[PDB]
């Protein structure tokens, strides 16, 4: 099928996939030129054997790095580390990243935290809310509870960085007092937890300001506008 | 202190033994501090500072001013990044960027699509206040699914290699952290009704090749 041209990147996402808009945001914020191909999961066009070849997991997003013989990176977290490590290499400037090893280990910690402790939990809460066969109030509570917990960890880390700086709402970040992919990983998701009953402005003030500083950046906005 | 590593795990935390295995396999000297989750020993104000998520495991890299890496995946990438630098040899990792993005893809798949699903399946089969069948099947099904993705990947590499059952790996026809990440978990799925030997033959030979390695064995012994 589709023959994506050897320059830039092609992103296989879905109109309602936060991890998708997550890669898009980082692409735009890093400058890279990319095109987004959405897919219909009900028309099962994501089971198209050629896509299945590049994304063994069958889940969006997937990014094809044409500049590299159509290399396909198929997990949002690995896509971010890829893009980030490739920018530092091409311009010697670690944007949204860090040159420090102890700094990177921290960026990764927050990235894995979001991808494996935060997104999954939000996903399960939406499931038991609107798509399960049965109706377990306890299943929903379990997850709205874990989502809040995970948000509390973030809220508190944000607070600590604000106080450690108090010695005026300036942006505070998770690592190196600089915007990194650690921070960006959460934004698309922060934007949808209200769907599972979580009000960030009321429940997580720090998180709310943090997301707000991020939602203000144009790179972040166009990406979210969509292709 | 200031030399080596300390690992805060738990006697039955797979992602904990995952870090232990890689430590052992990379040679680094480490001590493991188990935590009694019943006697609230992990709520110890001091631990909470190094491990902001409240979940095991956590690794302190003394050689680096007691730096704390608190996510098994971040821990793994730390260790192999620090070994390639130390010895110019990318053990359980790769020198190639395309290769790494692939190791990272499998690592993130394991940590965020595999481990969390097994955990829910276990929760609903053993720990949920209400033992709801539909809940359990949901996760039992998703675990089998993600295991299918692995099984089929492994198969592909065995055929692209057929010009006994030589070891086949997920990336670079070499054993990486991508492979090891799964091993502690593979060992537990029978607990949620999954027989890898009958259901996932490739996965079964893969885990077998990993379970034979002594480094893997002593680490699981419980250091």
Residue of A198, A55, A67, A36 lying closest to A121 (CA atoms): A198
Q: Counting every residue, how long is chain A? A: 227
CATH of the domain at A201: 1.20.1050.10
Nearest-CA distance B71 → chain A (Å): 5
Nearest-CA distance A57 → chain B (Å): 6
**Claim to verify: residue A13 and residue A82 sit in the same structural domain:** yes
Helix or strand (DSSP H, E) at B26: helix B14-26
Per DSSP, the three-state class of A9 is strand
Look up residue A33 and give its two tokens: 């030129």
Look up residue B161 and give its two tokens: 């290699």
**Claim to verify: residue B42 and residue B56 sit in the same structural domain:** yes
Total number of domains constituting chain A: 2
**Claim to verify: residue A121 and residue A202 sit in the same structural domain:** yes
Using CA atoms in the order B21, B26, B32, B36, what is the torsion angle rounded to 10 degrees?
-30
Method: X-ray
The number of angstroms, rounded, from the C-alpha of A42 to the middle of its chain's C-alpha atoms is: 23
Q: Which single residue is written with the structure tokens 């009958």?
A: B198
Residues contacting residue A166 through CB under 8 Å, at least 6 positions apart: none
Orientation angle between helical segments B201-212 and B133-159, nearest 10 degrees: 80
Identity of the residue in A59, A86, A138 whose CB atom sits nearest the CB atom of B129 = A138
Q: Are A59 and B113 inside 8 Å of each other by CB?
A: yes
In a domain, A227, yes or no: no
DSSP state of B174: B
**Residue B109 and residue A72: Cα distance in Å, rounded?**
14
In a domain, B223, yes or no: no
**Claim to verify: residue A76 and residue A102 sit in the same structural domain:** no
**Residue B23 and residue B31: Cα distance in Å, rounded?**
10
**Claim to verify: residue A16 and residue A110 sit in the same structural domain:** no
**Claim to verify: residue B11 and residue B63 sit in the same structural domain:** yes
**Claim to verify: residue A4 and residue A65 sit in the same structural domain:** yes
Q: Which single residue is written with the structure tokens 């998708």?
A: A20
DSSP states of A140-168: HHHHHHHHHHHHHHHHHHHHHHHHTT---
Per DSSP, the three-state class of B69 is strand
Question: Which chain A positions have a beta carbon within 8 Å of B104's beta carbon?
Answer: 73, 75, 77-78, 81-82
Q: Are B97 and A75 inside 8 Å of each other by CB?
A: no
**Claim to verify: residue A74 and residue A154 sit in the same structural domain:** no
Question: How many A×B Cβ pairs under 8 Å?
Answer: 129
Q: Counting every residue, how long is chain B? A: 223
- In a 13 Å sphere around the CA of A6, the CA atoms on its Cβ side amount to 2
**Residue B87 and residue B79: Cα distance in Å, rounded?**
12
In a domain, B174, yes or no: yes
Residues contacting residue A195 through CB under 8 Å, at least 6 positions apart: A126
Nearest-CA distance B203 → chain A (Å): 15
Q: Domain boundary residue among A39, A66, A91?
A: A91
Cross-strand partners of A65 = A9, A71
Identity of the residue in A57, A101, A116 whose CB atom sits nearest the CB atom of B116 = A116
Q: Are A112 and B73 inside 8 Å of each other by CB?
A: yes
Residues contacting residue A157 through CB under 8 Å, at least 6 positions apart: A174, B52
**Claim to verify: residue B20 and residue B104 sit in the same structural domain:** no
Domain that holds residue B105: 88-218
Q: Is A86 on the interface with B (CB under 8 A)?
A: yes
Q: Domain boundary residue among A32, A64, A91?
A: A91
Cα dist. B47→A131, B116, B191 in Å? 38, 23, 30
Identity of the residue in A58, A73, A102 whose CB atom sits nearest the CB atom of B101 = A73
């Amino acid at each position: 099928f589709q023959e994506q041209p050897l320059e830039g990147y092609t992103l296989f996402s879905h109109r309602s996939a936060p991890n998708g808009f997550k890669v898009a945001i980082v692409l735009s914020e890093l400058g890279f030129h990319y095109n987004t191909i959405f897919l219909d999961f009900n028309l099962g066009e994501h089971r198209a054997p050629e896509f299945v070849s590049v994304n063994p997991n069958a889940r969006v997003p997937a990014l094809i790095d044409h500049g590299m013989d159509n290399l396909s990176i198929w997990e949002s977290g690995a896509i971010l580390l890829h893009l980030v490590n490739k920018y530092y290499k091409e311009t010697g400037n670690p944007l949204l990243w860090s040159d420090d090893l102890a700094d990177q280990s921290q960026i990764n910690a927050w990235l894995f935290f979001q991808t494996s402790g935060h997104a999954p939990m939000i996903g399960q809460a939406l499931h038991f809310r609107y798509f399960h066969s049965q109706k377990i109030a306890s299943a929903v509570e379990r997850y709205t509870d874990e989502v809040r917990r995970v948000y509390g960890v973030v809220e508190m880390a944000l607070a600590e960085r604000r106080e450690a700086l108090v010695m005026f709402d300036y942006p505070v970040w998770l690592v190196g007092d600089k915007l990194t992919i650690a921070d960006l990983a959460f934004v698309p998701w922060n934007n949808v937890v209200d769907r599972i009953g979580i009000n960030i402005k009321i429940e997580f003030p720090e998180v709310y300001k943090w997301t707000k500083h991020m939602m203000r950046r144009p790179a972040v906005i166009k990406a979210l506008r969509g292709e």
